[PDB]
Design a binder for these strands. Structure first.
Ligand SMILES: [Zn+2]
Ligand SMILES: [Zn+2]
Ligand SMILES: [Zn+2]
Lengths: 129, 619, 43, 441, 173
DNA sequence: TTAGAGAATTGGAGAGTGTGTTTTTTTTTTTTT
C-alpha cells in the first residue's frame, strides 16, 4: 500500500486531495480453499475461498485511529489504533494521570467503513441433506 | 478410640451399636445365620452391598431399629464397619473392589410425600412413588489432585463436606498460589438426580400430584428409569439454596431431597424349562394347544390365533434380503376383540410395540428429531417400527394414519429399513419388524356389500404387503352367540385359581417362543420344496383357466414364511409337507375371508388393484 | 503383463495443501535468479 | 474390548476406551489453543509452552526468576500452537439401546487428523478417553474473569462459587463401526487388476453381467440388458457456451403388479453403491426432489433434500412412479433432463444438483396392461415425462403354465438349494470401466 | 530448561555434541595433548575440556557399560515400571480405605468423649467415622510456609541415563 | 561453646478500592390440508 501510494503520487501529484491511502487488492491467488477444509494451518495466511453471502450488516463507522478527551482537563489522548480484536481502553491521561470516564473525540477521530458479512458454502457444493 | 464415640447430641454409643448389629448379623435366622448366607453370596458374586430388612432389625432389637431410623447418617456407616469387619474376619483373602455398603430398607412405605415434615429431617424414611425423570450421570469429586505449575510436585486433598482445602503453597518448592487442580487426575464417583411423583393409586381425590427429588450415588444411580414405580428408602435431607450463584446468602426456606439408600421396584410384574419344552413340542396337536392358549380372555377365532402364533414364531432369517417377518392384518367394527388381541400380544412378545396409526398416538410410527427439553440437545427419536426391529409392532387404528405414515409403512414392509433425511442426519435405520395391524371400516359398521379395501380405504399397494388378512365379523347365529354369552358370564366368574393357570400357560408360551427363537433354524426338505412349487402352480391354475389371474409369485414367499414358521412351532427344524399343507390351508382361509367379492367369490386381483374384475367391467 | 500394462495405459489416457507446492516451484525460480546474478557478476 | 454408553461411568475417567455410537450433530471446526506463548509485559521475557487446562490459562509465574509479575502477560498468537478441534453429539446405536429407555446422548471431542471424519447419521467406533470437563464459566483467572445441583467449592480461582462437572469423551481415533482414475488404480490390487482384465477380455460379457446381476429374475433378458447399460451410463459433456449435455441414462419398467418390475429395482439398489430406493409417494415433506421447511432451531426456512438429491451422482430407483405428488411431477421435469432442482421460496434460493440416473417402475392404469393399446394409453405419464426416458420396458403377466413352473422352481431353489461373477467383482469392474470416455468414430 | 526434559537413553544436545567430537576425532587430539610432554602448556585447557565432557556422568555407572547392556536395561525398565505401578496401586488402596464408601456430603457427627477439645468441651468430629481409626488433629490443617531463609537446599539436577553410543564412547575415552 | 541483647528483613492482618446483580401473541409462509 505504501509503495502503491508512492507510484500513484508520482503519476498524479494532486491525488492526495482525493485519497490518503491506496489499498492493494490481490486477485487470482492460487491458494484456493474450501470453507469446510480450513484448518489451523491456514491461520494468519492469505487464503482464497468461495461461497454465498448469507448475511450483511449495514455499512457502520468503526474507529481506526481514535482520540479521547480527558475526563477532567482539556488534554486529548494520543492516536490509538483499533485492532479488530478488543475494545481499546485509553489508559490514563499523561498530563494528570486521571483514568475516569473518557469519551471519544468524534471530530479528531479517524473512522473507517466496516461491514461484517457471513458467507457459507454454495448450496450446489454442499451435499444433499 | 472407637469406644469413646457417641453420636452427636444422641447419647448412643457407636461401639455398642456396632456390636448389636454384629450379633444381629450372626444370629438372625427366621425370615420364614440368615445374613451370613448373603455374605457368602457377596463373596461369590462380587457385588459390594448387603440388603437388610428393617423389620428384621426391629424384631431382633427394637432399640437398634430406633437408633437406625433416628440417626442413619452415623448408624449406617457403623453398620458398614460392622459388616466389613465380619466379612473380612471370614473369607480372609477374598478381594473386593470396595468396602461393603449396608442397605437397610423397609418392605413398605413408612410415610407419603404429602406428610413429610421438618420433623423427619436427617431421618431414614421409605416412600412409594413413580419416576418422572432421571438426569445424566453427574461426577462428584472425592479426592482433588493438585500439581505445582512451577516444579510439578503433586499432592492430594480429601473432600470436606463438599469443599476443598486447596494448598496455598507448594511443599517441594515454596511458591505461593502455584498448586493447580488437575481435574482428570482427581478421583470421582457417580451421582444422579431423580424426580419422583407420588403414585396415582396414592394421590387423594382430585388433587395434582406431589413430587420429590432423590439423589442416588455409586451403584444405585443406574438402576431406575422413568416410568418405574419404586419404594425408595433413604435419608430425608434438607439443604440451603443460595439466592444467586455468585453470592453465599441462602434462603431461609430450605430445599429437601432424599439420599437414596435402597431401591425396590414394585411394578416389575434354563434346563428345567428346556426339558419340559422338548417333550411338549412332540406332544400331539401342540400347534392347536398353543393357538388356543393365545388370548384366553376372548371368544375364539381359530385362524386369527393360528396366524398370530405363526407370526410370533416367524420364518428363518438368512442371506438374500428376503424377510422372515410375517405381516398380519385384522379387520372389523369398533367393539370387536382385535384391540384386545393387539394389547395381549404386545404384553406377551419381547421387543414388542403398541401404538395407534392416528396422529394423536403416544409414540409415533415414523422417526423424527427433537430437542431434548431437559438438555436442549437434539435426539433422534426412532419410531416404533425401528424400536421393534426384532419383534412385533402392533398398530391399532391402522386405517386412520395419514399418507406420509402410509408411505413410511410401505417402505418398512418392502425394504425392512427406514430412511432418515432429517436436517443434517442421513442414515438407514433397521426395521426388521413383524407388523400386526388392526383396521376399521370407514363407515360405522362393516358394509357387507363392499369389499375389504373398499371399506377400510387403504391403498391396495400397502394391502398387498400383508401376508395374512382376517375379519372379526360375528354371525347372526344363536349357535355362536349363546356359547359366546356362556363364555362371557364364565369370564365374569373367573377366579384366582384360573388366573394362575392361565398365567402359567402364558408363561410357558413365552418360554416356548423364546426357546424357538434362541436356536431352532428350519430348512426346506425336498418334498416340502415340491409341495410349495406345486402349490403355487395349483393356485395359478384356477385363474389361468378362464383367462383371469388368481395368484402371483409373492404369495409363494408368504407360503414359504408360513411353512417355516409352522416347522418352527413343532420344533421339527426341517420343513415338510405337513407344514406346507398347513401354510396352504391358513393362507387360503385368509383369502376366503378377505379376498371374497360378495358376487363372484374369491378374486385375487382385488388385492393387486382397487375394486375387482366386476367393477372394472361395470365401468 | 504387456496387455495388462496396455489396459493400464488406456485407463491413464482416460484418467485426465498447495502452499508448499507454490513455495517449492517458486523456490526454483529464485534459485535460477541467484545463479544468473552470480554468473553475471563473475563474468 | 468395547464399552456401552451406559457404561461410561466415573470409573472410566482417564482410561483408554472404545465405544460405538451414532452421530447426531457435528459442530464447526475451530482452532483450539494447546500451548500458549506469552510475553511478560513488565520485563519483556517470553514464556513458551504454557499448557492449557479446561480454561484459558496464562503463566503462573514469569520465567525470569527475579521477576515478581504474576498476572500481566500478553499472548503472542502467531508463535503459539493450535490444534483443530470439533465437538460432535452421539447417541446409543439402535442395537445397543436398552428397551423402553430414552436414547442417552454423549459429547465427543475430535482433534487434529480426526476432525470432520464423521457425519451425522454415521455409526462410528470412537477410541479415546472419557474425561471430565468443569463448568469453566465459574472459574476466574488472570487470563479471563468468570461469567439444580451444587458443585464443589473452595478454590481460589472459584471464589465463592461452586464448580460443577460434566463427562465428555475425547476421541483420539474415529472409524466406521462396521464398513480419480489414478486413485482407483493405486487403491486396487494386482489380483483385482487380473480380474478386471479377464472381464474386459470376456466373451459373452453382456449376458454374463446380466445373469450375475439378476439371478432371481426369470427371463426378461432384454430388460436385464437395458438396466445394465443404465448402470454403465454415457459420457457427460459441456458445450462451448457452458451448457451441459446429459450423460445419464433413464429407464422405466412398466408392468402388471405380479411381474418382476420391483425386483429389478431391488437388485440394482442392493448391487450399486450410492443408490436410493424410494416410492413415488413421499415419506417426508421432501419427496423425490426437495422441499422447504422451517428449521426447528432457527425458525427459518431451509432445504430438505429429496431422493434425487440424495442419489446425486448415483441411481434413484423409484417404485410406483405413477403415483407422484404434483410438486414432484413438475420438478422431475428439470431433474430428469437438466439434472438440477431450482428452488425459489421464502428464505431460500437454490440450484441443487440432481445428476442421477433414474430407474422408474410403474403400474398400468386400472392395474393391468392391454396389448391392443399403446403404452401412452396404458400409463398415465404425460408426453414430456415419456420423452425423458431413454428406454421403456413392458412386463405382461402371461398365464403360461411352463413359465409359472419355472418361476416356482427358481424361487424355491433360491430359498432351499442356495444357502458367474460376484457382485463385488462387478462393482470393481463398473468402477474401473466408468472412468472410460469413449469417442464417436 | 525447556529441552532438559529429555528422558533417559535419548541423545541430548550435549550427547550429540560429544558424538560430534567422537566422529571428528578431536577426542584423540585431546588424548594426544594430555599425553604430550612437549605440549604440556595446554594441560589446564585440556583438563577443562575433559571436565565439561564428563560433566553428566557417574564413574561406576559408566564403567559398568558394555556389549550386553541393551537387554539388561530393557528388562530393568520393564521391572521398574511394574514396581512403580504396584506402589501406586497400594497407595491408592490405602487412601480408598482411609476415606469411606459414602460420598463426602453424607453427613454425621460424633462426640469423642475422652478427647478434650482446645477448650474443655469434648471433641466434635465431622470428618467421618472412617478417619477415627487413624485420627490425628492435623487432618484439616494447612502446612506452614517455610520462610525464605529456612528453605532447605535442593539438588541442582536430576540424573538421566545418556545415549548408549555416547556412554560407550565416554567409557572408551 | 552456648545463648542472649540490638538491628534489619519478611509474614500477614487488615484497611481501602472497584465490580455486578432483579410460557405468549400476532403474523408470515410452506406444506398439508
Ligand atoms: Zn488529563
Ligand atoms: Zn512447587
Ligand atoms: Zn517478567
Amino acid at each position: 500500500d505504501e509503495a502503491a501510494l508512492e507510484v500513484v503520487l508520482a503519476m498524479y501529484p494532486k491525488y492526495d486531495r482525493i485519497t490518503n491511502h491506496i489499498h492493494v487488492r490481490i486477485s487470482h491467488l492460487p491458494l484456493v480453499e474450501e470453507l469446510r477444509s480450513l484448518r489451523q494451518l491456514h491461520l494468519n495466511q492469505l487464503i482464497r475461498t468461495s461461497g454465498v453471502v448469507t448475511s450483511c450488516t449495514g455499512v457502520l463507522p468503526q474507529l481506526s485511529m481514535v482520540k479521547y478527551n480527558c475526563n477532567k482537563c482539556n488534554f486529548v489522548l494520543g492516536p490509538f489504533c483499533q485492532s479488530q480484536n478488543q475494545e481499546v481502553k485509553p489508559g490514563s491521561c499523561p498530563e494528570c494521570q486521571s483514568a475516569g470516564p473518557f469519551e471519544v473525540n468524534m471530530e479528531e477521530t479517524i473512522y473507517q467503513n466496516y461491514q461484517r458479512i457471513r458467507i457459507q458454502e454454495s448450496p450446489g457444493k454442499v451435499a444433499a441433506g | 478410640l472407637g469406644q469413646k464415640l457417641v453420636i452427636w447430641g444422641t447419647d448412643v454409643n457407636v461401639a455398642a451399636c456396632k456390636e448389636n448389629f454384629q450379633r444381629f448379623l450372626q444370629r438372625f435366622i427366621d425370615p420364614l445365620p440368615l445374613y451370613m448366607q448373603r455374605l457368602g453370596e457377596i463373596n461369590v458374586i462380587g457385588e459390594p452391598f448387603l440388603n437388610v430388612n428393617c423389620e428384621h432389625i426391629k424384631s431382633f432389637d427394637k432399640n437398634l431399629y430406633r437408633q437406625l431410623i433416628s440417626y442413619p447418617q452415623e448408624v449406617i456407616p457403623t453398620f458398614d464397619m460392622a459388616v466389613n469387619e465380619i466379612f473380612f474376619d471370614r473369607y480372609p483373602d477374598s478381594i473386593l473392589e470396595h468396602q461393603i455398603q449396608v442397605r437397610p430398607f423397609n418392605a413398605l412405605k413408612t410415610k407419603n410425600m404429602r406428610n413429610l415434615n421438618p420433623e423427619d429431617i436427617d431421618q431414614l424414611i421409605t416412600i412409594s412413588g413413580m419416576v418422572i425423570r432421571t438426569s445424566q450421570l453427574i461426577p462428584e469429586m472425592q479426592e482433588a489432585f493438585f500439581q505445582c505449575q512451577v516444579c510439578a510436585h503433586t499432592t492430594r486433598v480429601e473432600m470436606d463436606r463438599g469443599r476443598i482445602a486447596e494448598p496455598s503453597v507448594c511443599g517441594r518448592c515454596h511458591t505461593t498460589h502455584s498448586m493447580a487442580l488437575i481435574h482428570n487426575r482427581s478421583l470421582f464417583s457417580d451421582k444422579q438426580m431423580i424426580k419422583l411423583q407420588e403414585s396415582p393409586e396414592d394421590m387423594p381425590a382430585g388433587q395434582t400430584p406431589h413430587t420429590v427429588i432423590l439423589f442416588a450415588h455409586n451403584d444405585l444411580v443406574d438402576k431406575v428409569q422413568p416410568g418405574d414405580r419404586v419404594n425408595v428408602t433413604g435419608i430425608y435431607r434438607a439443604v440451603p439454596i443460595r439466592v444467586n450463584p455468585r453470592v453465599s446468602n441462602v434462603k431461609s426456606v430450605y430445599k429437601t431431597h432424599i439420599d437414596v439408600i435402597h431401591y425396590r421396584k414394585t411394578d416389575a410384574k434354563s434346563e428345567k424349562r428346556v426339558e419340559l419344552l422338548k417333550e411338549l413340542s412332540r406332544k400331539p396337536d401342540i400347534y392347536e394347544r398353543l393357538a388356543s392358549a393365545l388370548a384366553p380372555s376372548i371368544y375364539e377365532h381359530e385362524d386369527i390365533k393360528k396366524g398370530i402364533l405363526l407370526q410370533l414364531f416367524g420364518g428363518t432369517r438368512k442371506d438374500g434380503k428376503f424377510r422372515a417377518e410375517i405381516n398380519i392384518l385384522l379387520c372389523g367394527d369398533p367393539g370387536t376383540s382385535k384391540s384386545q388381541l393387539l394389547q395381549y400380544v404386545y404384553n406377551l412378545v419381547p421387543r414388542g410395540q403398541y401404538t395407534s396409526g392416528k396422529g394423536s398416538s403416544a409414540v409415533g410410527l415414523t422417526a423424527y428429531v427433537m430437542k431434548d427439553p431437559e438438555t436442549r440437545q437434539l435426539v433422534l427419536q426412532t419410531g416404533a417400527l425401528v424400536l421393534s426391529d426384532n419383534g412385533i409392532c402392533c398398530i391399532d387404528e391402522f386405517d386412520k394414519m395419514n399418507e406420509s405414515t402410509r408411505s413410511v409403512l410401505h417402505e418398512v414392509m418392502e425394504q425392512q429399513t427406514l430412511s432418515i433425511a432429517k436436517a443434517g442426519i442421513i442414515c438407514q435405520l433397521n426395521a426388521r419388524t413383524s407388523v400386526l395391524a388392526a383396521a376399521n371400516p370407514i363407515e360405522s359398521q362393516w358394509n357387507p356389500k363392499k369389499t375389504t379395501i373398499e371399506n377400510i380405504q387403504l391403498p391396495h399397494t400397502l394391502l398387498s404387503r400383508f401376508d395374512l388378512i382376517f375379519l372379526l365379523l360375528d354371525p347372526q347365529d344363536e349357535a355362536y352367540d349363546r356359547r359366546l354369552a356362556h363364555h362371557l358370564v364364565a369370564l365374569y366368574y373367573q377366579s384366582e385359581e384360573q388366573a394362575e393357570e392361565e398365567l402359567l400357560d402364558m408363561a410357558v408360551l413365552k418360554d416356548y417362543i423364546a426357546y424357538a427363537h434362541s436356536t431352532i433354524m428350519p430348512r426346506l426338505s425336498e418334498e416340502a420344496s415340491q409341495a410349495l412349487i406345486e402349490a403355487y402352480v395349483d393356485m395359478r391354475k384356477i385363474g389361468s383357466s378362464r383367462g383371469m389371474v388368481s395368484a402371483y409369485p409373492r404369495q409363494l414367499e408368504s407360503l414359504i414364511r408360513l411353512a417355516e414358521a409352522h416347522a418352527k412351532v413343532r420344533l421339527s427344524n426341517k420343513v415338510e409337507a405337513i407344514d406346507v399343507e398347513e401354510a396352504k390351508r391358513l393362507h387360503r382361509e385368509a383369502l376366503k375371508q378377505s379376498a371374497t367379492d360378495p358376487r363372484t367369490g374369491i378374486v385375487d386381483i382385488s388385492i393387486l388393484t382397487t375394486g375387482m374384475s366386476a367393477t372394472s367391467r361395470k365401468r | 503383463n504387456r496387455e495388462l500394462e496396455a489396459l493400464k495405459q488406456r485407463f491413464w489416457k482416460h484418467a485426465n495443501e498447495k502452499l508448499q507446492v507454490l513455495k517449492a516451484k517458486l523456490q526454483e525460480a529464485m534459485k535460477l535468479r541467484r545463479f544468473e546474478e552470480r554468473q553475471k557478476r563473475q563474468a | 474390548t468395547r464399552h456401552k454408553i451406559r457404561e461410561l461411568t466415573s470409573s472410566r475417567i482417564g482410561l483408554l476406551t472404545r465405544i460405538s455410537g451414532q452421530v447426531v450433530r457435528t459442530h464447526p471446526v475451530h482452532p483450539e489453543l494447546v500451548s500458549g506463548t506469552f510475553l511478560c509485559l513488565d520485563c519483556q521475557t517470553v514464556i513458551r509452552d504454557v499448557e492449557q487446562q479446561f480454561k484459558y490459562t496464562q503463566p503462573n509465574i514469569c520465567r525470569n526468576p527475579v521477576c515478581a509479575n504474576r498476572r500481566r502477560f500478553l499472548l503472542d498468537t502467531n508463535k503459539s500452537r493450535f490444534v483443530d478441534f470439533q465437538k460432535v453429539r452421539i447417541q446409543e446405536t439402535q442395537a445397543e439401546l436398552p428397551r423402553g429407555s430414552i436414547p442417552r446422548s454423549l459429547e465427543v471431542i475430535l482433534r487434529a487428523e480426526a476432525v470432520e471424519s464423521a457425519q451425522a447419521g454415521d455409526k462410528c467406533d470412537f477410541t479415546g478417553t472419557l474425561i471430565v470437563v468443569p463448568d469453566v464459566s465459574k472459574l476466574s483467572t488472570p487470563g479471563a474473569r468468570a461469567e439444580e445441583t451444587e458443585g464443589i467449592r473452595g478454590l481460589r480461582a472459584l471464589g465463592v462459587r461452586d464448580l460443577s462437572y460434566r463427562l465428555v469423551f475425547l476421541a483420539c481415533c474415529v472409524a466406521p463401526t462396521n464398513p480419480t482414475a489414478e486413485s482407483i488404480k493405486n487403491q486396487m490390487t494386482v489380483k483385482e487388476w487380473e480380474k478386471v482384465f479377464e472381464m474386459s477380455q470376456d466373451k459373452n460379457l453382456y449376458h454374463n453381467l446380466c445373469t450375475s446381476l439378476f439371478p432371481t429374475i426369470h427371463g426378461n433378458d432384454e430388460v436385464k440388458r437395458g438396466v445394465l447399460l443404465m448402470l454403465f451410463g454415457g459420457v457427460p459433456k459441456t458445450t462451448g457456451e457452458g451448457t451441459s449435455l446429459r450423460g445419464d441414462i433413464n429407464v422405466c419398467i412398466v408392468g402388471d403388479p405380479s411381474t418382476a418390475k420391483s425386483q429389478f429395482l431391488k437388485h440394482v439398489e442392493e448391487f450399486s453403491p450410492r443408490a436410493v430406493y424410494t416410492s413415488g409417494k413421499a415419506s417426508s415433506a421432501a419427496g423425490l426432489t426437495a422441499a422447504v421447511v422451517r428449521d426447528e432451531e432457527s425458525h427459518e426456512f431451509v432445504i430438505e433434500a429429496g431422493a434425487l438429491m440424495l442419489a446425486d451422482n448415483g441411481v434413484c430407483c423409484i417404485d410406483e412412479f405413477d403415483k407422484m405428488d404434483v410438486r414432484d411431477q413438475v420438478a422431475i421435469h428439470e431433474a430428469m433432463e437438466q439434472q438440477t432442482i431450482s428452488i425459489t421460496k421464502a428464505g431460500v434460493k437454490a440450484t441443487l444438483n440432481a445428476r442421477t440416473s433414474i430407474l422408474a417402475a410403474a403400474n398400468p392404469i386400472s392395474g393391468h396392461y392391454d396389448r391392443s393399446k399403446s403404452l401412452k394409453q396404458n400409463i398415465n405419464l404425460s408426453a414430456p415425462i415419456m420423452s425423458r426416458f431413454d428406454l421403456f420396458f413392458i412386463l405382461v403377466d402371461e398365464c403360461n403354465e411352463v413359465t409359472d413352473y419355472a418361476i416356482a422352481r427358481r424361487i424355491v431353489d433360491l430359498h432351499s438349494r442356495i444357502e458367474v461373477y460376484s457382485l463385488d467383482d462387478i462393482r470393481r469392474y463398473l468402477l474401473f470401466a466408468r472412468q472410460f470416455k469413449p469417442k464417436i468414430s | 530448561l525447556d529441552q532438559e526434559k529429555k528422558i533417559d537413553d535419548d541423545a541430548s544436545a550435549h550427547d550429540q555434541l560429544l558424538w560430534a567430537i567422537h566422529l571428528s576425532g578431536l577426542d584423540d587430539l585431546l588424548l594426544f595433548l594430555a599425553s604430550s610432554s612437549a605440549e604440556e602448556q595446554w594441560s589446564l585447557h585440556v583438563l577443562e575440556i575433559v571436565s565439561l565432557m564428563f560433566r553428566d556422568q557417574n564413574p561406576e555407572q559408566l564403567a559398568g557399560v558394555g556389549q550386553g547392556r541393551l537387554a539388561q536395561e530393557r528388562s530393568a525398565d520393564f521391572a521398574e515400571l511394574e514396581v512403580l505401578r504396584q506402589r501406586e496401586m497400594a497407595e491408592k488402596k490405602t487412601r480408598a480405605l482411609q476415606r469411606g464408601n459414602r460420598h463426602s456430603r453424607f453427613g454425621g457427627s460424633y462426640i469423642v468423649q475422652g478427647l478434650k477439645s482446645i477448650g474443655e468441651r469434648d471433641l466434635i468430629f465431622h470428618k467421618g467415622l472412617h478417619n477415627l481409626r487413624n485420627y490425628s488433629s492435623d487432618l484439616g490443617k494447612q502446612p506452614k510456609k517455610v520462610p525464605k531463609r529456612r528453605q532447605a537446599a535442593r539438588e541442582l539436577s536430576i540424573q538421566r541415563r545418556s545415549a548408549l553410543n555416547v556412554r560407550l564412547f565416554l567409557r572408551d575415552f
